[PDB]
Amino acid sequence: HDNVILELTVRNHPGVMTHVCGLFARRAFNVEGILCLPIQDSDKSHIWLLVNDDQRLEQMISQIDKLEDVVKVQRNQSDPTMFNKIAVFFQ
């Protein structure tokens, strides 16, 4: 499984997830898993995307950070099996 996990720190405002996924949509780029949780006592959230490793990711990652509501992006700084662990309880 050549997947990578992008962990985004975003503003918790309407529209943010549509802007982020929209960038994958415009590249015909499937997102495999998503988690989004608010960060307590803040106006921000984390979004985790699970996507396949692709030669276009580095430029897409740069495009994600340029979004006004994305304050930060990390790649493969999350538990690599988090979606396998979550799935076990919720399927």
Q: Is residue 22 a contact point for ligand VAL (CB under 6 A)?
A: no
Q: Is residue 67 a contact point for ligand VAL (CB under 6 A)?
A: no
Query: Footprint of a second copy on residues 30-59 (CB under 8 A)?
Result: 30-40, 46-48
Torsion-angle region of 55 (φ positive above 0: left; ψ -120 to 50: alpha; else: beta): alpha
Question: What does the alpha-carbon distance between residue 21 and residue 35 come to, in Å, rounded to a whole number?
Answer: 12
Q: Which does 10 bind (CB under 5 to 8 A by kind): ligand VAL, a second copy, none?
A: ligand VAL
Q: Which residues pair with 3 in a beta bridge?
A: 52
Quick one: which of 1, 2, 55, 89 contacts a second copy (CB under 8 A)? 89
Question: What does the alpha-carbon distance between residue 81 and residue 65 come to, in Å, rounded to a whole number?
Answer: 24
Q: Which residues bind ligand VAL (CB under 6 A)?
A: 10, 12-18, 21, 24, 30-31, 34, 36, 45
